[PDB]
Amino acid sequence: AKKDPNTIMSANSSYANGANGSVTNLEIPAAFGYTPDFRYYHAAADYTRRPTIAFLMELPNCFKDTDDAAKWGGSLKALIEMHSRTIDGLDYTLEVEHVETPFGGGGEMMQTLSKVRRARSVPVFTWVEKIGMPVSRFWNNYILYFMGEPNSNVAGIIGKGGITPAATYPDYNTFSVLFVEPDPTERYALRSTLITNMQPTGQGPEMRMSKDQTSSPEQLQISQTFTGLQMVGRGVDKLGQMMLDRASQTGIDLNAQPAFLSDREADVAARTDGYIDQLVSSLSKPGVAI
Amino acid sequence: AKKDPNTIMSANSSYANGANGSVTNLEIPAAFGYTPDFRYYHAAADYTRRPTIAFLMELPNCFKDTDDAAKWGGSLKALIEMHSRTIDGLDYTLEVEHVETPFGGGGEMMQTLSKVRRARSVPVFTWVEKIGMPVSRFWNNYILYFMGEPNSNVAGIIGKGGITPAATYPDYNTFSVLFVEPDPTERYALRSTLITNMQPTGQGPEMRMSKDQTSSPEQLQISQTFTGLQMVGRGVDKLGQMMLDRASQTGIDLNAQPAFLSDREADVAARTDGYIDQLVSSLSKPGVAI
Amino acid sequence: AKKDPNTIMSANSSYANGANGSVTNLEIPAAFGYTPDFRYYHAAADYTR
Amino acid sequence: AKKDPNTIMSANSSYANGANGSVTNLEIPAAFGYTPDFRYYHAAADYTR
Amino acid sequence: HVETPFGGGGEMMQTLSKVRRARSVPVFTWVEKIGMPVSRFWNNYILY
């Protein structure tokens, strides 16, 4: 119940600027020197990765030209944030390059800095399909009516009148999402990324049919890849922290949630052939005495 | 037994236009957010995939020049609809392609929409041979007479004098089929495809022979690949639903069906050597009384 | 199996004078306009030498 | 989905006289100077033949 | 068959060209007996 006061950085400074939570001090004695020290074991706790959260920032402008923008917007929001079974393809690792010249004839070489780069994010989503199969319809109709159509290569929305001449710009049929890596307590942001220019790319939903009556019916799983143009910095970290602050937990107790069934339905009460029924209206009790 | 009123979309609109059955409302909270809520578990039921039904729509015109068009046209319908052990190769997945140009020298890029295309169906049927080899004979004679003949590359039906010109058009020796992927109750159609221009292509039936008297005799399976042009959309779904409204299940009950034998056959009744015979004729019948 | 009655030239006149067999009608829609139509694909059958 | 109001020419004039649609301003900062700017990426869309 | 695109969406049109038939390459198998009458038979057949 005690640890050294220098275990946690007093202030988030220098290379820890912009950090949201508590950052361990690297100047505390470590285990891999001469010998491990038990006095500083509180500072040896590890870091474990937690699932990422998708926050939707922008809706496409094409939704306003349909019959119900509320439906399209809400469906996209739920699919991005709540139906996301998995995510993958996010990466902004750095990469350094050097130029090399021999240092004498003996075999040594002299290395000089050349360039620095950054990896690219390729958002990938996975969904599990449901009764009435709404997800495949959502994405197929999105592509067909807001992007090209295979037979003619023209969006099906333009079959209406009055679509603006500026339909070809990305804002018409693209959106933006924010990815955040929270802490174990879900109170601070450790990593954030802001990707835009997002619309379906590559293969669409898997639409296939076949007949085999002896084979057990199976379960479909949608997977889609997206375009992206990502940004990272400290402003994105602040944006992620604000988004995380909007999601408060005070007062929540999953143990004390009210049961989703308050009491048995009326049909059960009428059958009068249960455990309580025998006591209520079968046995006599003249009483007990001594 | 009480789901929320908003689990099922009240009406099919937006991306659900033309849907036949009941489509789940996709703005109900899902289980992959902060926590799942047990009050919305009826909405977690998963889509499960059922076998495809094939309907014959057109017959080749060459059946007319034959001595019996009825038998050809009945055999083709039965083979397509009833004897089809397995079907595969039906696919109309989409595909989107983009073009790129770097957004600076860091590594990022800007992707611009280029084109959208659709997949192609390659129907494959599979059958099991029967006594007399009717399937292999049907298909071999179809190819030989209504299609090229290997030693002359001429249809064998032309040996009759009077065959009309315009025998090179597909309507002479091609047919059409409609495929439907229904729901668990088999009342509403979820996916459909209307392929035409269908006729055998590539390898025909098996046709090998061999001698081995020490081996166990084996069966014969027929695999046939076809050609075709397919259409997809909403009109095809309406056509499929019109087809599936027929073949209604009202009235039938497999459990209550009559047995395929009503009573023992006469020769059995003449032997007089069974269970009932002992009671009826052998045992003494004095009567029991007290 | 049915097709458009205008699929085949009926007279073999103009540039089809002297033809022996049947000739397709060039005035029925082809696939390389705005979009193809599946109602007229019978005229998309091709030549083979 | 919001983009810079100055992304498109207000009037097709100068070298854009007679243009038949929307034309990029060619005045928004490009991506090949000191750095690319993400506030002006809507104008980085490319013509496609 | 031959093939030609039916529009630019990806669908294609297929037409008949030719029909061909397979070819037989018979193979027999025997088991040798005392003496070697089978080998002698075939070798002398070929040689003479």
Numbering used by the authors:
A (entry chain L), B (entry chain G): 2 to 291
C (entry chain B), D (entry chain A): 2 to 50
E (entry chain H): 99 to 146
What does the paper say about this structure?
The Klebsiella jumbo myophage ϕKp24 displays an unusually complex arrangement of tail fibers interacting with a host cell. We observe the tail fibers are branched and rearranged dramatically upon cell surface attachment. This complex configuration involves fourteen putative tail fibers with depolymerase activity that provide ϕKp24 with the ability to infect a broad panel of capsular polysaccharide (CPS) types of Klebsiella pneumoniae. In this study, we combine cryo-electron microscopy methods, protein structure prediction methods, molecular simulations, microbiological and machine learning approaches to explore the capsid, tail, and tail fibers of ϕKp24. We determine the structure of the capsid and tail at 4.1 Å and 3.0 Å resolution.
Like other described contractile ejection systems and bacteriophage tails, the contractile tail sheath of ϕKp24 is assembled around the inner tube. The sheath and inner tube follow the same helical symmetry with an additional 6-fold symmetry around the tail axis. The structure of the tube-protein (gp119, accession number QQV92088.1) was predicted using AlphaFold2 and flexible fitted into the ϕKp24 tail EM map. We used gp119 to build a model of the tube of phage ϕKp24. One ring-like structure consisting of six tube proteins represents an assembly unit of the inner tube of phage ϕKp24. There are two most prominent features of gp119: (1) the long C-terminal extension can reach another gp119 located in the layer directly above (toward the capsid); (2) the N-terminal domain can extend to a neighboring gp119 in a same disc. For phage ϕKp24, the sheath interacts via hydrogen bonds with inner tube: the residue R623 of the sheath protein gp118 can interact with residue D268 of tube-protein gp119 via a salt-bridge. The outer surface of the tube subunits displays a positive charged patch. The C-terminal domain of the sheath protein binds to the tube’s patch via a complementary negative-charged patch on one of its two α-helices.
